[PDB]
Amino acid sequence: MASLTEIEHLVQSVCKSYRETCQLRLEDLLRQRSNIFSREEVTGYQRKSMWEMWERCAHHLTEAIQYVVEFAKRLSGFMELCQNDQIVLLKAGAMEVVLVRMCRAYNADNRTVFFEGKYGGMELFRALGCSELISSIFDFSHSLSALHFSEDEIALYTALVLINAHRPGLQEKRKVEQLQYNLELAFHHHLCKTHRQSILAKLPPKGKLRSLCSQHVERLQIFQHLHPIVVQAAFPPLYKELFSKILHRLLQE
Ligand SMILES: COc1ccc(Oc2c(Cl)cc(NC(=O)Cc3cccnc3)cc2Cl)cc1C(C)C
Questions:
Q1: Where is the motif named AF-2 mapped on this chain?
Q2: From 57, 140, 204, 244, which residue has the greatest number of CB atoms within 10 Å?
Q3: Does residue 57 have its Cβ closer than 6 Å to ligand 1?
C-alpha cells in the first residue's frame, strides 16, 4: 500500500489543508511582533477578575479549536472514519493541535505570546491563578520554537498529533493505524527530502502534550468548583463539551 508518488500527494494535501484552516497566517503574526503590551496594559490584565480572564481565554481557545475541527474535516481519510472515531480523536487531540499551533504566535527573543492584538509575557495571565500551567505552555512553545518549524512541518506534525491510533475509545483502530502510518511516511519522507530528519530526536515526547492537556482539565475543574454559574452561563458550549453535543453538528456541515 501507498507508493512514493501517493506519499508526495499526501504531503501536499496535508499542507494545503493546514494553510486553508490557519486561524491567522504566519506573516500576520510576525508583522505584529513589535506591537507589545505596555506596562499599563499588563497591569490592566492582572487587575481583571479571575472569572473574566478565564472566560476570555476559554472564548479564544474555542475559536482556535473551531479551526482545528475544520483542519480535521479537510484531512484525507478523516471524514471516512466512523463518527465515534472522529469525535474520540477531536476530543483528545484538538487542544493538543492548538498547543502546537500556538508556537507560531510565540516570540522566543522576548518570551511573549500574541493575545488580543498584541504581544505579552507570562505575567499577562497572572489573574487566571494557574501560573504553573501558563509557564508550562510558554516552555512548550519555547521548546517548539527552537526547532524553527516550516509551515509544512507544522502541518504534517499536527496531522499526526490528531491521527493517533492509540486513543482509548476507538472502534475501528486498524483504520486509524493505516491513516497514522501513511501520515508518518509523509512526514518522514518530507523530512528526508528537505534534510530535516535531525528534528526527529528533538520532537517533544507524546507525554508532554498529554501533560499540558491534563493540567488544563485539572485547572478548569478547580475554577469551575469556585465559579459553577460562570462556566454554565458564560463559557462557550463547545469548550464545556470538550473539557468540562456541538461536535456532532460541527462535523456534519
Ligand atoms: C491550555 O489552556 C490554555 C491555553 C492558553 C491560554 O492562554 C492563551 C490564550 Cl487563550 C491564547 C493565546 N494566544 C493566541 O490564541 C494567539 C493566536 C491567535 C491566532 C492565531 N494564532 C495564535 C495565548 C495564551 Cl497563553 C490559557 C489556557 C488556560 C489556562 C485557560
A1: 238-243
A2: 140
A3: yes
